[PDB]
């Protein structure tokens, strides 16, 4: 785990990338609040399966005990679906690419009980990713970080060194791209601060989701794996 | 102006803006914390106005920044002042609570535990006051940041990163240790946001835009 070079880390992660799934094939439009919720729910659930496989490929992840793994996923799943959303939405200004066959815009997002707020936040995040020209290899570094860090609250120590290893890898990608040492640290901070907002959106979303078992589910899923 | 400060000028500006540590004036426990929070707010606005870049913002923007960061600000200060009081939260010098005392409020334990773990992690990394003050300003500037305006703030933020690294180098960490520590501290900003988000839920379960607007307004007519 802590034996991978910057480059080995990066390729490992890129390989672990989950596939991009599709929305239940053309149901009916315009959707309703429940119909859209249903497409979104079906999608998320199917994506949750791949997430488990990806998690299991995240350096450090499978060194933890099954129950700690469940804890990290329990807490990060929504952040992780969201960073994937934002990233695949980058080249669709004004719209979110929940799936290739389900590209919604601000107005569609209002069909559901106050997701406008989040949708907008989400919109702004890919926008900033676009603005910063976020790169694939950095994106995968940010996801792994979200996975290890949202739930981190000799094992504690282990995760902190994997986390330090991903920072190393993020700065290594920046240097190799020619950034100045000053630009390196600035970009590193611009990225980690975006995790603050990502977290923010998942807490808002979790609230919106519950206004409208996971442990056991993930345990079952993680153990089955 | 803000963008022209050196790393060391930034730090002292900041150290200078520190609010005073207030005391508990003593829904009893909830009373105590509401009174404390309320009086702290008043100084927060004041310190806000001394964060480089902050006053270059429109009044609306200033209120949006505090509207979203106030609780993260209160918490990071609680955390910091709790550091050397393992097992307890030092809400005030005359109001040091423990895990169990936090239990007397429904839902407070989980946040309380979270608050405890954050000060623990601050202890663990030997967070320095200079670094602390740096992290508070980033919180103010970042939690509500979501067009030469957007850009200003982002530059102020870059300068804070610069200052953060400066203190680290100055302290003698290696280049590698610098980005590592920088990253360790900024991931703690997600947990802080997390506690704030959870804390507002809890606050509103129990039972401000203009409040700050007036406050930010009144500050220009204050002696
Ligand atoms: O709409 C969803 C969403 C819907 C249902 C979900 O979960 C339903 C239940 N499921 C139970 C087993 C554990 C996995 C979750 C999760 C996300 C998505 C998001 C969301 C956005 C705004 C908002 O206000 C609330 C949520 S973002 C997102 C990205 C995706 O790839 C998929 C769904 C989503
Ligand atoms: O208890 C408080 C607190 C209590 C009442 C508050 O609100 C007072 C209402 N007021 C209205 C106008 C805006 C300013 C707040 C805010 C914080 C504090 C915290 C808290 C912790 C756990 C939790 O679940 C909820 C809150 S943390 C904290 C730090 C302080 O310096 C002061 C109070 C606090």
UniProtKB/Swiss-Prot annotation, chain B:
The modification Phosphotyrosine is found at residue 209. Changing residue 51 to E: Has higher transcriptional activity in the absence of wild type ER. Inhibits transcriptional activity when coexpressed with the wild type receptor. It is found in: Nucleus; Golgi apparatus; Cell membrane. Residues 6-219 form the NR LBD domain. Phosphorylated by cyclin A/CDK2 and CK1. Phosphorylation probably enhances transcriptional activity. Self-association induces phosphorylation. Phosphorylated by LMTK3 in vitro. Glycosylated; contains N-acetylglucosamine, probably O-linked. Residues 1-223 are annotated as: Interaction with AKAP13. Residues 6-223 are annotated as: Transactivation AF-2. A lipid is attached at residue 134 (S-palmitoyl cysteine). Nuclear hormone receptor. The steroid hormones and their receptors are involved in the regulation of eukaryotic gene expression and affect cellular proliferation and differentiation in target tissues. Ligand-dependent nuclear transactivation involves either direct homodimer binding to a palindromic estrogen response element (ERE) sequence or association with other DNA-binding transcription factors, such as AP-1/c-Jun, c-Fos, ATF-2, Sp1 and Sp3, to mediate ERE-independent signaling. It is linked to Estrogen resistance: A disorder characterized by partial or complete resistance to estrogens, in the presence of elevated estrogen serum levels. Clinical features include absence of the pubertal growth spurt, delayed bone maturation, unfused epiphyses, reduced bone mineral density, osteoporosis, continued growth into adulthood and very tall adult stature. Glucose intolerance, hyperinsulinemia and lipid abnormalities may also be present. Binds DNA as a homodimer. Can form a heterodimer with ESR2. Interacts with FOXC2, MAP1S, SLC30A9, UBE1C and NCOA3 coactivator. Interacts with PELP1, the interaction is enhanced by 17-beta-estradiol, the interaction increases ESR1 transcriptional activity. Interacts with EP300; the interaction is estrogen-dependent and enhanced by CITED1. Interacts with CITED1; the interaction is estrogen-dependent. Interacts with NCOA5 and NCOA6 coactivators. Interacts with NCOA7; the interaction is a ligand-inducible. Interacts with PHB2, and UBE1C. Interacts with AKAP13. Interacts with CUEDC2. Selective estrogen receptor modulators (SERMs), such as tamoxifen, raloxifene, toremifene, lasofoxifene, clomifene, femarelle and ormeloxifene, have tissue selective agonistic and antagonistic effects on the estrogen receptor (ER). They interfere with the ER association with coactivators or corepressors, mainly involving the AF-2 domain. Composed of three domains: a modulating N-terminal domain, a DNA-binding domain and a C-terminal ligand-binding domain. The modulating domain, also known as A/B or AF-1 domain has a ligand-independent transactivation function. The C-terminus contains a ligand-dependent transactivation domain, also known as E/F or AF-2 domain which overlaps with the ligand binding domain. AF-1 and AF-2 activate transcription independently and synergistically and act in a promoter- and cell-specific manner. AF-1 seems to provide the major transactivation function in differentiated cells. This is Estrogen receptor. It comes from Homo sapiens. The gene is ESR1. The chain holds residues 306 to 551 of 595 of the full protein.
């Amino acid at each position: 785990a802590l034996s991978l070079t910057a480059d080995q880390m990066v390729s490992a992660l890129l390989d672990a990338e989950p596939p991009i799934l599709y929305s239940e094939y053309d149901p009916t439009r315009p959707f309703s609040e429940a119909s859209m919720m249903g497409l979104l729910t079906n999608l998320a659930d199917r994506e949750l399966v791949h997430m488990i496989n990806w998690a299991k490929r995240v350096p450090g992840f499978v060194d933890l005990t099954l129950h700690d793994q469940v804890h990290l996923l329990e807490c990060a799943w929504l952040e992780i679906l969201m960073i994937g959303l934002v990233w695949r939405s980058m080249e669709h200004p004004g719209k979110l690419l929940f799936a290739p066959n389900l590209l919604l815009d601000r107005n569609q997002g209002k069909c559901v009980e106050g997701m406008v707020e989040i949708f907008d936040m989400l919109l702004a995040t890919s926008s900033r990713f676009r603005m910063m020209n976020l790169q694939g290899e950095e994106f995968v570094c940010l996801k792994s970080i979200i996975l290890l860090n949202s739930g981190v609250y000799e094992e504690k120590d282990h995760i902190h060194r994997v986390l330090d290893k991903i920072t190393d890898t993020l700065i290594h990608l920046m240097a190799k791209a020619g950034l100045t040492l000053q630009q390196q640290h600035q970009r590193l901070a611009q990225l980690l601060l975006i995790l603050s907002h990502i977290r923010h959106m998942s807490n808002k979303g979790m609230e919106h989701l519950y206004s409208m078992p996971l442990y056991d589910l993930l345990l079952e899923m993680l153990d089955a794996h």
